[PDB]
Amino acid sequence: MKILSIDTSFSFINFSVIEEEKVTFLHYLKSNKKTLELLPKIFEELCIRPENFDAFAVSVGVGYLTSLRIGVTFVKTWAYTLGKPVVSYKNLELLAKKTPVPFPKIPYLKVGSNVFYQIFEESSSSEVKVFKGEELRGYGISLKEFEDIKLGEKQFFHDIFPFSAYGGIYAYEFLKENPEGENVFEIEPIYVKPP
Amino acid sequence: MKILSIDTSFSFINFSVIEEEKVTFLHYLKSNKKTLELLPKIFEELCIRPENFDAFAVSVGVGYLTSLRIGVTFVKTWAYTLGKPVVSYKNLELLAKKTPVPFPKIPYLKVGSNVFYQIFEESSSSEVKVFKGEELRGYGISLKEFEDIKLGEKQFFHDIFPFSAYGGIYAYEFLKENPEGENVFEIEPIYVKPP
Amino acid sequence: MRTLAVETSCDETALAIYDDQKGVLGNVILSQAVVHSPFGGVVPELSAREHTRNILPIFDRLLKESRINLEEIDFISFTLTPGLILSLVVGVAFAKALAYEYRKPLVPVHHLEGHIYSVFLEKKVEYPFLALIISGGHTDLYLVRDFGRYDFLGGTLDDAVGEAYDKVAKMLGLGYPGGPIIDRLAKEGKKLYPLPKPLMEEGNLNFSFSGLKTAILNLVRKEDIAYSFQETVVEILLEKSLWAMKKTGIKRLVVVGGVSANSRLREVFKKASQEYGFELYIPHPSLSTDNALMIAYAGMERFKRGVVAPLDVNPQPNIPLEEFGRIWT
Amino acid sequence: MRTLAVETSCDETALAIYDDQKGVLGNVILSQAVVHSPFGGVVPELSAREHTRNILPIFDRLLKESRINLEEIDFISFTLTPGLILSLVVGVAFAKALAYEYRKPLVPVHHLEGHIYSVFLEKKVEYPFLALIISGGHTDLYLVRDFGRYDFLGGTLDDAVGEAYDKVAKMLGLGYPGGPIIDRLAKEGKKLYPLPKPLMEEGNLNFSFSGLKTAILNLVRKEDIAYSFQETVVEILLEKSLWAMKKTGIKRLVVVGGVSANSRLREVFKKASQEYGFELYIPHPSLSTDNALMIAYAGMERFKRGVVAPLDVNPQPNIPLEEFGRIWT
Ligand SMILES: [Fe+3]
Ligand SMILES: [Fe+3]
């Protein structure tokens, strides 16, 4: 099983290859170039070709909506035309699940002027919320990029957290129990705010 | 400050660029190619040129000794000839410092037939030890690659942990207080066993 | 040769396959009118979401209806500019995904250039000719000397014709789409009240329409109002077109864009061509509104001249047609 | 033109700069004899650590003594094979680091090819010629028809001469380096005891030396033993060399490698060239042991023929000289 996993949520675009249940390739670039300047030229530069993969994974956010729409459209087009499974994954869920701090876990990411966060307990979780300054109980989890933003009683900041790597490992697990993947026509970025 | 950070400890070779205190580039490849087949051709493919950096960082392990010697020699040669600072960093220290599990922390990595581990308390740490099956108190920390190996009372496995990214962030912090870096002639892989 | 064309510049998701020997091999469109109707206009973010959602199902229908394999496509044509940038990027992403996957060249098309070439689908037009483009945010006259060679002659100083129809219908309270509703109320108008024609100076090829919502407020059956507004607009369009032929000496006129589907407009321009003896080309109504077949035709013209885009080509909200033609031809 | 040469194939870290018009511009070596001495031989892992540690300080000395800038180097020469692979990779890494940094070509050299060309540093030798290479794990005869064109004629079926010296000295209890110690005890030998010469069949160009540690045990002053062993070895080397000249008809002989520094060997071969009238080339002793100048000279020969290595060139513990020459020339 060889999976191409893509993350276009932030200016640190990144993609991974998952094989034998592990990351065998990861490319991560923080760029001010526009998403369509980078894609698909960056794939050609790294000799990444969609026909070489058994399955695809893609972040649906939270993240910047235009760059999410662009990445999701690349991947859906490849997965649908090649008849290959595709798995979506969620950034804040990965941040909570992969960070071994105690509950409650408050992963958060900033997109434009909004700080989006979500609250994870052991057996339940909230919707994605928009931070307004509220005092929050528990452990904030974010990225070094957002180190200046404090949520919860304590904060942990990942120096780096390439969502495409974690999403690809998750997709690998997902496809063991659901080999058909998720419905390709239904993959959409997560929308928190209305249009 | 633009740092090129290199990790040749394992078959997942990886390098990062650190700027403005953050990872702006990371390339991570699990390859069965020999270290000198990959270096320096992989740099030419990614347009990475040593004269473009202010400083260099390199892992001294623990890791495979020949691939560590090769990476350290690349970086020392560049840092010395360009007159740029260089910072070494240690893999097991990074694994402990960056994983928010409780103390004691037992990071471990496998190299050939040896499992090397180190014990971290809040204010002291052990030497790098060789695991012989002993029951250990505390939280084991390793990589998914080594998920089949259990140390300590609980285990945490990083899906991915590119040492060059964490080492480059550390080197960035290091150079703020010690702008001259470490003595380039003294950078050597960590040796645990005798020759 | 044949191309798959992609058009997502505004509020319609359009894909088509065109073969320059066999003609239309496939053609699928999905309008977003229903979803924007409650807001009284196109909402950019919502339009982008709709393109993202609808483009794959539309493609699936296009592939099942055409029965064509993507390996048999010679190049991907797509609209690069102008339009809503949040919608443009969806079609470009889709076009570049297929082009990279199938190792096919990319050929960019300017949306108004597509509208010009929508009449070539039915009948080739000799150069040079005049193009009146009347759709969306545009009411322009161009002198087309060759493919890629478009001289801007005049445009609207305020509202385009489409926006005027919407503002008028909303003024007297009516559905958002504006166009169809006024063309149907106007068919029922008995008396023709006089309205003032704005610019209308000797040799001036620009347009103004917002100076009609003023005289409209100075007022009667809503049918006579729709009828009177529609007559004044069409007359302004014709006179400006006539002046452009006299100023240039060119007696071929292409009338394109969504407003070119208006049945009264078609009467008045056809009549004038009969009375004045100039050649008139208006597309079938199915080609007056946004579609990807017109993108395919202009893509053929540009490909045949050896012009392809690099893989990192990036859409932009508004490159002028004249400049686009120089850059890309 | 000029090259920086890198040699880390065994237990000496050697860097040199050679200019084909100006001669030696720099030359620095550091032996690891002291560190391996306690183990009675070269320890591979320890040797690799020493190269890693010593190569940068040696370079710093080379740059300060030569005063040359790396921008002025035309290409990097380096030993690719044969040798200890854990040591080889250190010099290759260093050579490839500089080549990539400074955008200079890489030119690989076979270590025994370096030994052949160590005499060209003092005097060019006409082709074809015979090479007796006597160093390390090698006691070989080659017919050199041109640069890169080496025909293997014979080699040792057990111990090389260097290993024989070490095994003999250890046999009668002495320091590890073996060579120098026996050459100095032998200078004090009075009586010459007879020892059996192994192969020594008519026209056979192979070598055997381990059949001497047997007759040695059948035994007297340790000085007479060293003297008798040394005489038998040198005589075996000479007779085999003489037979090779008669079998090939070629009367030019190059004698290279560390054992070529032995003062008794030089006497016997020089005498034979005087008595038989063949041309003999032995390098200055400073060039008999590993150095990078000989690597530089062979690197010049290969570069001048247009041959460079790709960036991903990989060392190997043991490509045969004959095959290496065909591959790389
Ligand atoms: Fe349009
Ligand atoms: Fe040697």
Author numbering:
A (entry chain B), B (entry chain B): 1 to 195
C (entry chain A), D (entry chain A): 1 to 219, 226 to 335
Publication text:
The universal N6-threonylcarbamoyladenosine (t6A) at position 37 of tRNAs is one of the core post-transcriptional modifications that are needed for promoting translational fidelity. In bacteria, TsaC uses L-threonine, bicarbonate, and ATP to generate an intermediate threonylcarbamoyladenylate (TC-AMP), of which the TC moiety is transferred to N6 atom of tRNA A37 to generate t6A by TsaD with the support of TsaB and TsaE. TsaD and TsaB form a TsaDB dimer to which tRNA and TsaE are competitively bound. In this study, we reconstituted tRNA t6A biosynthesis using TsaC, TsaD, TsaB, and TsaE from Aquifex aeolicus and determined crystal structures of apo-form and ADP-bound form of TsaD2B2 tetramer.
Therefore, we resolved a crystal structure of A. aeolicus TsaD–TsaB in complex with ADP and Fe2+ and a crystal structure of A. aeolicus TsaD–TsaB in complex with Fe2+. In both crystals, the asymmetrical unit contains a single TsaD and TsaB. α2 and α3 from TsaD and α1 and α2 from TsaB interact to form a typical “helical bundle” interacting interface of TsaDB dimer, which conforms to those of E. coli and T. maritima TsaDB dimers. Two TsaDB dimers from symmetrical units further interact and form a TsaD2B2 tetramer. Crystal structures of A. aeolicus and T. maritima TsaD2B2 tetramer exhibit that two β3s of TsaB form two antiparallel β-strands that mainly support the dimerization of TsaDB. The dimerization interface also involves ionic bonds and hydrogen bonds between α3 and α6 (in A. aeolicus TsaD2B2) and ionic bonds between α1s (in T. maritima TsaD2B2). Our structures captured an apo-form of TsaDB and an ADP-bound form of TsaDB, which are perfectly superimposed with an RMSD value of 0.18 Å over 4017 atoms. In our crystal structure of A. aeolicus TsaDB, the helical hairpin α1–α2 (Ser31–Glu50) of TsaD simultaneously contacts the connecting loop of α6 and α7 of TsaD and the C-terminal tail of TsaB, and adopts a conformation that prevents anticodon stem loop of tRNA from docking into the t6A-catalytic site of TsaD. Structural juxtaposition of A. aeolicus TsaB, T. maritima TsaB, and E. coli TsaB exhibit that A. aeolicus TsaB adopts a conserved fold of the N-subdomain and varied fold of the C-subdomain. A. aeolicus TsaB is composed of more long-range unstructured regions (with well-defined electron densities) between β7 and α5. In t6A-catalytic center of A. aeolicus TsaD, we identified an oxidized state of Cys10 (CSO10), which is in range of van der Waals force contact of the TC-moiety of TC-AMP (about 5 Å).
